[PDB]
Amino acid sequence: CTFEYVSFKNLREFVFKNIDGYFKIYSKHTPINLVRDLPQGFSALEPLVDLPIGINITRFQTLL
Amino acid sequence: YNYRYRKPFERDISTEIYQAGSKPCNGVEGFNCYFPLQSYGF
Numbered sequence: 001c002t003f004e005y006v007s008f009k010n011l012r013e014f015v016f017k018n019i020d021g022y023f024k025i026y027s028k029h030t031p032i033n034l035v036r037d038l039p040q041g042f043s044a045l046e047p048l049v050d051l052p053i054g055i056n057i058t059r060f061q062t063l064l
Numbered sequence: 065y066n067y068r069y070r071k072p073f074e075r076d077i078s079t080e081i082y083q084a085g086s087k088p089c090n091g092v093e094g095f096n097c098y099f100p101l102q103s104y105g106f
């Protein structure tokens with residue numbers, strides 16, 4: 001508890017990775033025509049945050 | 065007694081016993097079963 005911080009026709013994309021105690025987040029957002037599968041094409045995700053937290057992540061879960 | 069020792073930039077405060085022996089120590093201290101923290105005699 002030693003760290004704390006504050007700041008279907010749409011597709012949100014994200015990347016999460018943890019390296020040498022820093023946790024990094026990237027994203028991209030767009031409208032879309034077809035909602036059941038990922039749209040065939042290309043655009044690149046860009047950074048959001050980089051957290052100095054030091055934790056040993058092996059699992060994750062979504063919140064609805 | 066407050067000052068104690070047990071990847072890069074890791075931190076870990078977990079209290080689970082060192083199972084130094086072949087014994088599954090299951091929270092009980094004894095020969096080769098020890099609490100993970102030791103204190104500097106400052």
Ligand SMILES: *[C@@H]1O[C@H](CO)[C@@H](O[C@@H]2O[C@H](CO)[C@@H](O)[C@H](O)[C@H]2NC(C)=O)[C@H](O)[C@H]1NC(C)=O
Nearest residue numbers: 019020021054055056057071072073074075076
């Ligand atoms: C994640 O957990 C592992 C154990 O599951 C930690 O491993 C220890 O890491 C140090 C690094 O210097 C080694 O000297 C120890 O020998 C490792 N222990 C064992 C039993 O292999 C690891 O440090 C943890 N990583 C983070 C980022 O917290």
